[PDB]
Design a protein around this ligand. Sequence first.
Ligand SMILES: Nc1nc2c(ncn2[C@@H]2O[C@H](COP(=O)(O)OP(=O)(O)OP(=O)(O)O)[C@@H](O)[C@H]2O)c(=O)[nH]1
Ligand SMILES: CN[C@@H]1CCc2c(ccc(O)c2O)[C@H]1O
Lengths: 280, 233, 331, 52
Amino acid sequence: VVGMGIVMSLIVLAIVFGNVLVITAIAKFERLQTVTNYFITSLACADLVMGLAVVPFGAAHILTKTWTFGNFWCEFWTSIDVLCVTASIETLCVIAVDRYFAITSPFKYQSLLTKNKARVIILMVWIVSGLTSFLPIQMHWYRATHQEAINCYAEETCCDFFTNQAYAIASSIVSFYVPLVIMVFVYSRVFQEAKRQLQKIDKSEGRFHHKALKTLGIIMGTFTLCWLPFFIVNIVHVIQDNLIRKEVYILLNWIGYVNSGFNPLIYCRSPDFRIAFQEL
Amino acid sequence: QRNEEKAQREANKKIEKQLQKDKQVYRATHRLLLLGAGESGKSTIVKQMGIFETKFQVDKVNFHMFDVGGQRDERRKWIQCFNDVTAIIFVVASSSYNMVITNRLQEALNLFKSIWNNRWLRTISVILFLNKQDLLAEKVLAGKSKIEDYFPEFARYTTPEDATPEPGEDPRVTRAKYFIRDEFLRISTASGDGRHYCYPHFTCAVDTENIRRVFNDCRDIIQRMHLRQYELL
Amino acid sequence: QLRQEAEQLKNQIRDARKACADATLSQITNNIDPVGRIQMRTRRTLRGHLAKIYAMHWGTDSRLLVSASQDGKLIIWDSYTTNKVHAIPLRSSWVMTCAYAPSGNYVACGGLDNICSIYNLKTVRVSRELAGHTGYLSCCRFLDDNQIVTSSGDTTCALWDIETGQQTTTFTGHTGDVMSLSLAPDTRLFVSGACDASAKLWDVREGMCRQTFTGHESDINAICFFPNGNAFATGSDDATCRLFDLRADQELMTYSHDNIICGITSVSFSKSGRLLLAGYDDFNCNVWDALKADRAGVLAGHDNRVSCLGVTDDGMAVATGSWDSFLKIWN
Amino acid sequence: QARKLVEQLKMEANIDRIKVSKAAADLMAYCEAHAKEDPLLTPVPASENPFR
Ligand SMILES: Nc1nc2c(ncn2[C@@H]2O[C@H](COP(=O)(O)OP(=O)(O)OP(=O)(O)O)[C@@H](O)[C@H]2O)c(=O)[nH]1
Ligand SMILES: CN[C@@H]1CCc2c(ccc(O)c2O)[C@H]1O
């Protein structure tokens, strides 16, 4: 337990530093303010909120093995967890669809995406995440019914997660399983277009004269490896009881959290962004 | 007092609204620059489809062409203004290898090399039209003139394996056409690396497929730019 | 025959120039106190242009100014409150210069259409079109309410009559494109720098060339009179500036640095004639010392190449324009 | 065309020229005399600055 605090103190610092740097670099310089960069700001805001108001309280609760903040703060913390996770995941699908539209139809891309439409889309995404998280949890439509659930809800010092079979399925479907297929289809089409363009170039100037695969592999693999096992066990532990332990659940959930710190290292590797970072 | 301030604010609001309205029209049009050597056929190719500008629409897309013919200086100090165009159209008469006017193709090649290697024009692609195909075929069929007299390297040149000659093409006319196209592509490929490319076409004065060719080339140009921006290409 | 006589005359001129160089400006100004450190901060930023900017001219009242952009617009600002006053749409989208009349009644324009156009502000509509040049316009300046001097790319300059649209006189002698000009304070002479690395001192009343200076090594992009009227400065694309004297008829000082390799797009003096502000291709502006040739400040608030630069008549502010479609007022 | 150039050089050859020291002294005197009324040289108080 001595080194656990040391290792968990670095995650908060990394998340906060990366997201603060990204937000400050976007806000300070006018040349970086485009339509595409609006979604990155929302993703950074969600990751920053997760790094600030989620990781420290969870780490303290794990270390002390007791929730010393009554019963209101446990529910508020759970609502914030769900809200931040959903709002972070949906922005990746938004960005993927944006790139799909930008590459597949280049003539109509300028007219399709505007500042007002981007703002409307971001507001809709955040509203949907809030409806998924805050509305059911605070209205007590997610609690379970077994004796252990009642006992843990009664205790003020105990704050554990118990849900009914329908809520887990609905939340997993809304948060993870719907964006995944959309992103897979989008990136398949993008890879096809890139391959076609490369073939045309080679057929044109082949006599005188890998990147897409690596980029797509990074983008898909990071997200899938970070968030896939948790949303499998989230249904496994309700379908088949007495099959999933608590420590495994916590470990997979925390593996999911650290994906919020890797985001600035994937969506902000641009010469303009690097120059902006250097100027700071 | 505030009486002048209110009128100033109203005028500023009206001007800003007009500018916002005009920005949408400005951002959804494509500008093209038309260049060519002397007697190459710029006027004939533009009529079929200080300064001269034409506007045409294909597939509900707005296009806007320019033809700078008012200035005929050997140097081009006005070439730095056209550093934000979609593409450049270069027209050359490929059937003028025996006109002294160094012959004409040498001057055209030098002009193409100078345009390609320019500080401001380092991210603009070129659509290349090799005009006057029928005259080139007629010259090749006749034995009066030989290309090796003016271009010695043609003697050791051989037709590339990847070719698409039409049924009416003789083995010699195809060889000459591909020799000239390769002569241009050799200069094209050496200088740039991924930033901008060249699109060569064989054109005469009776075909009416040039608008489709420009449309497809511009679509490819924008698609490649977007692919390269995201590091997918 | 004639060529030998021309060479002999050139040698005689060169020998005559060398006999009058008793001392140097750098030697005389050794004991004067240095200007020190000068720092300028942006006060206003103007937005509204959809494309890059080439031209800008201050008003006589030191409050209004005009600007021209590639999108085909001509906007008049109010630097005190940042309020757009006018927006004139242009027939041709390729504009390269603009000017603002001394009385504020009219504004001129020109570009790649080989035509100079005058607009009546206090009537906005086109008032007169001047044609006859066979090359793109590079500059235009108002002598008074009824006269204007223009230069074009056909190696000639002309003096126009707006009322009738006729060239009163024409100036010839350059072997390259004329790139800029500037009028004397009393409006009796003017200078023009061309693309053959030479500048000449013309006479408006007579119509003849009086002096020629050939100190540079490449194209000349900018020119500006000293406030006194007995000197001027030029800026070429070889990253050098030079100060010429009319009476001594030779170069006095050179403003160059070893860390600058980019070209110069515009120059301008100050109210007292002590500072010299020059814009460069490396996205920033440098401030020199006229009597020392020592750099004394840098203005680095732009994100693209600086194309124009101007100082107000009262010497209260400096305006700059760039290719990112933004103007900035420094103080 | 050569005759015109010869005439131009002949006209330009006969011009009086003054000492470089005199011109430098005149420029220095003008700069020194008009140094007080230069808002860009000596910064102006913020009371009389219309841009701030
Ligand atoms: N026989 C034949 N002549 C052609 C063909 N294409 C172009 N031409 C020549 O083109 C000429 C028509 O004038 P343009 O092609 O516009 O030449 P231009 O007006 O001088 O154009 P620029 O030199 O670029 O300014 C005719 O006299 C033809 O000789 C062709 O396919 N067949
Ligand atoms: C306690 N951590 C929570 C538990 C369940 C859950 C999470 C995230 C998104 C969801 O849709 C969920 O249902 C996890 O972050």
